[PDB]
Amino acid sequence: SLPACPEESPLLVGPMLIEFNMPVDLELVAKQNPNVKMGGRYAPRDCVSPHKVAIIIPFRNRQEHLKYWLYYLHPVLQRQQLDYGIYVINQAGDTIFNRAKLLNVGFQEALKDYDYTCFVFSDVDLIPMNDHNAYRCFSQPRHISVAMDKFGFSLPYVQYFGGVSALSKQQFLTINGFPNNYWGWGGEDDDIFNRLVFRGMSISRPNAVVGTTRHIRHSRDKKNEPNPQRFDRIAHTKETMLSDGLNSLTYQVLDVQRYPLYTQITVDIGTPS
């Protein structure tokens, strides 16, 4: 009987103040966000959202950033009137990090929970400064974190597609998902950009003011060193995407934790083959 939510949420307040210098207590954040259900799920109670969104976070040893992420995003996602769920894909073990393979795991595993039709892929340390920056999907792949403080509030280059993005289920399937062999830092987001272009799509973005985003300043994590093969890998995306991605993926889930504000999937994604 519920009518459809309006096209744009009337609850949005625009520009918000973001700070990362205070402690965060997730028990309290949960109290502040009473309508968020076990596992970090929420749907509005007064209308039906056409946006069934799984928010995927690549993760390992960033609990503090995550706390900030949950404190700021949860209120924003409810104001955006989304039918959403949060998934932190925690990489088991201590070997070289693989951001994009975790993202692929996230897509596959969240689909087992619910009929999601949109996927937001977000680094754990990026917080939006304006709730008008929609964390849902569009008719074309959506780049969300378009104006980051660390890049001077502008794109570092015009084809930059890293940070936070949103792909509908169909867009993600059309590019065979993300590459599984970008181990260590860099390039996997450029590869993904290439995949979208090679499948006839173009990047949708909000304007630079609405797209303003804060990056929690942090130092280098061990086990995610710049991948030296990244420039050669992005040069062959058209050929490699055909057989590297969803259709060449395996992983072993070790544990699934339903916390009040998010579901954490700990997974073994292995090492280079």
Ligand X SMILES: CC(=O)N[C@H]1[C@H](O[C@H]2[C@@H](O)[C@@H](CO)O[C@@H](OCc3ccc4ccccc4c3)[C@@H]2O)O[C@H](CO)[C@@H](O)[C@@H]1O
Which does residue 156 bind out of ligand UDH, ligand X, Mn ion, none, counting CB within 5 to 8 angstroms by kind?
Answer: ligand X
Q: Rounded to the nearest whole angstrom, what is the least distance from the CB of residue 4 to ligand UDH in the complex? A: 33
- What's the closest the beta carbon of residue 233 comes to ligand X, in angstroms? 8
Among 125, 131, 188, 190, binds Mn ion (CB under 5 A): 125
Q: Both tokens of residue 56?
A: 């995927």
Span from 111-119, 170-178, 187-195, 252-260 in contact with ligand X (CB under 6 A): 187-195
Q: Tell me which residues in 138-177 interact with ligand X (CB under 6 A).
A: 156-157, 159, 162
175-198 residues labelled b (16+ CB within 10 A) or e (exposed): bbbbbbbbbbbbbbbbbbbbbbbe
Identify what 99 binds: Mn ion, ligand UDH, ligand X, none; CB under 5 to 8 Å per kind: ligand UDH
Alpha helices in 116-187 (DSSP H): 169-174
Is 202 exposed, middle or buried (CB count within 10 Å of its CB: 0-12, 13-18, 19+)? exposed
* 142 annotated ligand-binding residue: no
Integer Cα distance of 174 and 196 in angstroms: 8
Q: Which is nearer to ligand X, 44 or 58 (CB)?
A: 58
Binding flag, residue 247, ligand UDH (CB under 6 A): no
Does residue 269 sit in helix, strand or coil? coil
185 is in an annotated binding site: yes
- Which of 68, 71, 72, 97 touches ligand UDH (CB under 6 A)? 97
Check whether 215 is labelled as a binding-site residue.
no
Site for ligand UDH in 181-200 (CB under 6 A): 185
DSSP for 77-104 reads: HHHTT-EEEEEEEEE-SSS---HHHHHH
Q: Are 118 and 166 in contact (CB under 8 A)?
A: yes
Measured between its terminal Cα atoms, the distance across the chain in Å is 52
* Residues near ligand UDH, by CB under 6 A: 57-62, 97, 99, 123-125, 185, 219-221, 224
| Site for Mn ion, rule CB under 5 A | 125
* Annotated binding-site ranges for UDP-alpha-D-galactose: 58-62, 97-99, 124-125, 185, 218-221
